[PDB]
Amino acid sequence: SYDIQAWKKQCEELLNLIFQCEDSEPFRQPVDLLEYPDYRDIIDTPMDFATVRETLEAGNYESPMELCKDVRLIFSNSKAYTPSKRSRIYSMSLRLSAFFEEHISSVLSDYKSALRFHKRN
Numbered sequence: 001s002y003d004i005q006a007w008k009k010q011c012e013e014l015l016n017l018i019f020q021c022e023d024s025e026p027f028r029q030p031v032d033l034l035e036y037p038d039y040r041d042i043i044d045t046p047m048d049f050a051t052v053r054e055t056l057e058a059g060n061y062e063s064p065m066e067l068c069k070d071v072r073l074i075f076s077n078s079k080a081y082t083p084s085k086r087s088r089i090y091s092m093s094l095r096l097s098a099f100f101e102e103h104i105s106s107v108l109s110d111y112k113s114a115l116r117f118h119k120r121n
C-alpha cells in the first residue's frame with residue numbers, strides 16, 4: 001500500500017468521525033476568550049479542529065505527522081488549561097485523544113512505509 005498521497009483523504013475521514021462525536025464539541029472552534037479571559041496567559045498556541053481541517057483543505061500540511069502535531073496540541077492545551085484532572089472538558093479531551101491515537105497510527109505507518117518504498121533504490 002505505497003500511495004504517498006493517501007494520508008490526506010484518510011485524515012479528512014478521521015476529522016469527519018471526530019466532528020460527528022459529542023466529545024469533540026469543546027474543541028471544534030477556537031476557545032472563547034470572553035468565556036475564559038485568562039486563556040492566553042496559560043496557552044501560547046491555541047489550536048482547534050476547524051483550524052486543522054482548514055489547514056488540511058488549503059494544502060498547508062506536507063505530511064500526516066504535521067497534522068498529528070496540531071491535533072496533539074489541542075489535547076496538550078486542554079491539559080494545561082484544566083483546573084482539575086476530573087474537569088468535564090479535560091475528561092472529554094482524553095476520550096478524543098484515545099480515539100485519535102487508535103486511528104491515526106495506521107495513517108502514519110502507511111505514509112512512512114510509502115516514503116521508504118519511494119526511496120528504496
Ligand SMILES: O=C(NCC1CC1)N1CCN(C(=O)c2ccc(Cl)c(Cl)c2)CC1
Pocket residue numbers: 016017018020021023024095096099100
Ligand atoms: O460519523 C460517524 N460514523 C460514520 C460511519 C459510517 C457510519 N461517527 C463518528 C464518531 N464515531 C466514532 O467511532 C467515535 C467514537 C468515539 C470517539 Cl471518542 C470518537 Cl472521537 C469517535 C462513530 C460515529
